[PDB]
Known about the structure:
The structure holds two protein chains of two kinds.
Chain A: E1 4-9, H1 10-23, E2 28-33, H2 36-45, E3 50-53, H3 55-63, E4 66-74, E5 92-99, E6 114-117, H4 123-137, E7 148-150, H5 184-193, E8 199-203, H6 204-209, E9 228-231, E10 237-238, E11 249-251, E12 255-259, H7 263-277, E13 304-308, H8 316-320, H9 322-332
Parallel strand pairs in A: 1-2, 6-7, 6-8
Antiparallel strand pairs in A: 3-12, 4-12, 4-13, 5-8, 5-9, 5-11, 9-10
Chain B: no helix or strand
Family (chain B): Belongs to the transferrin family.
Protein name (chain B): Lactotransferrin
Subcellular location (chain B): Secreted; Cytoplasmic granule
Amino acid sequence: YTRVVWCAVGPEEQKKCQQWSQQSGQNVTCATASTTDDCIVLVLKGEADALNLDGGYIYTAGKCGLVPVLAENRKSSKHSSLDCVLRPTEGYLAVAVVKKANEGLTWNSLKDKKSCHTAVDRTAGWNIPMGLIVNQTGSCAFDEFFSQSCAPGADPKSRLCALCAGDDQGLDKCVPNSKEKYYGYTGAFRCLAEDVGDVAFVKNDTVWENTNGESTADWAKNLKREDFRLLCLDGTRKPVTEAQSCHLAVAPNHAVVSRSDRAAHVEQVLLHQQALFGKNGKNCPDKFCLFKSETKNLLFNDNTECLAKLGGRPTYEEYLGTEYVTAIANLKKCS
Amino acid sequence: LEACAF
Lengths: 335, 6
Ligand SMILES: *[C@@H]1O[C@H](CO)[C@@H](O[C@@H]2O[C@H](CO)[C@@H](O)[C@H](O)[C@H]2NC(C)=O)[C@H](O)[C@H]1NC(C)=O
Ligand SMILES: *[C@@H]1O[C@H](CO)[C@@H](O[C@@H]2O[C@H](CO)[C@@H](O)[C@H](O)[C@H]2NC(C)=O)[C@H](O)[C@H]1NC(C)=O
Ligand SMILES: Nc1ccn([C@H]2C[C@H](O)[C@@H](CO)O2)c(=O)n1
Ligand SMILES: *[C@@H]1O[C@H](CO)[C@@H](O)[C@H](O)[C@H]1NC(C)=O
Ligand SMILES: [Fe+3]
Ligand SMILES: [Zn+2]
Ligand SMILES: [Zn+2]
């Protein structure tokens, strides 16, 4: 009765989930929704068990009583003696990325430029940059700051969706799932790369994984890191190798959430699913890799090395951290 | 300040 129902956001995640479902012998099966918020509702109704969320979505889910269960953990250096499953998580760097050739764009000259955001309510793509901008401007009018944006999940007719491209048919403009061409870390970095926007709010790892041949994908295969700079909060611009001194925040890793009443079962099932399909899994690369989707970050980030146990059975507030939680609260006072 | 958005 530890069949776990995974919630897949949009059709491409649904398709990966189906392949996992098949390979797991139906130990995992799939519910699908059009948006992460709808997936959280399925979970609240007990029609789905679990999904992996960005931190801004953990805030939504945790306000509704869902709880973190295991965290994404990626490649490390300190704690290298520890198994991935037991290693604490280190968070990721939220950065603002621009074209090196867009000279004299700084953090301080962002007003009226064109932005690319991973999705509204996400950590690096939205709560951190807009939280900081609202704070620095003294103004809740975050929808008037950038001239045009792609911020998937905003009103499709608003300027915050103007740059979004929708799917290969032009349908679904600005839907917050991977059907939207500019959705997600990779979508928003693509919106910069193709110069639809002036600035992408993604994380440090995005830049590296879609540059210098790390991605074979047609829009990314020719990008060189040297053509990009980070915007530091002090007004300077740095190379993308300096993200440790040039970021907007350290974000809590993406984590699996579930209803509390199902958390222990979801954990057990996932720990065994990743022994089969995770990074050195018995059946990956052979049959299925849970943490691969050709750079589209479907269900989990493709840079995930394992899902790791959480120290201290944290509540969603403890997992997010008090400072991040309050930053999210404060920003939400605007809208 | 507090309560589920659904
Ligand atoms: C920013 O992100 C990149 C990509 O994740 C990091 O580079 C990786 O770091 C690990 C070990 O530290 C290396 O073994 C990988 O080979 C690197 N990956 C690639 C694709 O180059 C970089 O360390 C991160 N920088 C910071 C400050 O976090
Ligand atoms: C935006 O401004 C508010 C106000 O300073 C910040 O919230 C404060 O955060 C500090 C540090 O975590 C807390 O001790 C205060 O109690 C919080 N203040 C209030 C009034 O709630 C918030 O962190 C800022 N946002 C960002 C993204 O930096
Ligand atoms: N991808 C990440 C995530 C975190 N950090 C480390 C550097 C931050 O400065 C530190 C904050 O405690 O965590 C890092 O270098 N790279
Ligand atoms: C499915 O779960 C059962 C019960 O724990 C286990 O015996 C089996 O190995 C699992 N198979 C897969 C492919 O997950
Ligand atoms: Fe994120
Ligand atoms: Zn820092
Ligand atoms: Zn606690």
